[PDB]
Amino acid sequence: AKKTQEGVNSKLALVTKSGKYVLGTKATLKTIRDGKSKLVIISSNCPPLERAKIEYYAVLGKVQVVHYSGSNVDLGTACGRYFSVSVLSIIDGGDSDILK
RNA sequence: UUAACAAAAGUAAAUUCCACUGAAAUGAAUCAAUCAGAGAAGUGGAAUUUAUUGGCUUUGUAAGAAAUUCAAUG
């Protein structure tokens, strides 16, 4: 009933194709501050301090928070990128079904 | 030729931070390295160090001193 990250992992590949996402932690907070964020993904090794800042913003902004299983390196690869992504915002998912 | 201590016309090198923005066709850089979505490069700023104030030229001290000449103190 675990290792579901052939879903969200596969889902976070159509977003690279058709959707729009914002990578990073400081860039995520801007989306939550506006109404442009519909989903937030936090890696497993995000520091506990400002991880708690993102879920506090997300509660205030009424956004859904997804706790990714892998590290910021694993999340970055899942986006097809060659750096590490610790926190992700799904502004819009074109043909994927994460926002469902 | 110019001191301690102070001043702030003009103008430096290096490092670390801040704001805007968000990098992949990956870029930035050193003699070497090294660094970046826990955020690079760019632009604009803040701070500290550089034999006292604030590093260097400059200024007050201060030319009245001192050095090199001349005349018989100037």
Spatial CA neighbour of A12 closest among A86, A98, A92: A98
Tokens 């060659």 belong to A82
Cβ(A89)–Cβ(A22) below 8 Å = yes
Beta strands A40-42 and A87-92 are antiparallel
Burial (0-12, 13-18, 19+ Cβ within 10 Å), A41: buried
Solved with: cryo-EM
- Nearest nucleotide from residue A73 CA, by C1' atom: B37
CB burial string A68-90: b at 16+ within 10 A, e below:
bebebebbbbbbeeeeebbbbbb
- Give, in Å, how far the C1' of B27 lies from the CA of A81: 14
* Identity of residue A65: V
Spatial CA neighbour of A86 closest among A12, A23, A21, A32: A23
Whole-angstrom Cα distance, residue A3 to residue A65?
Answer: 18
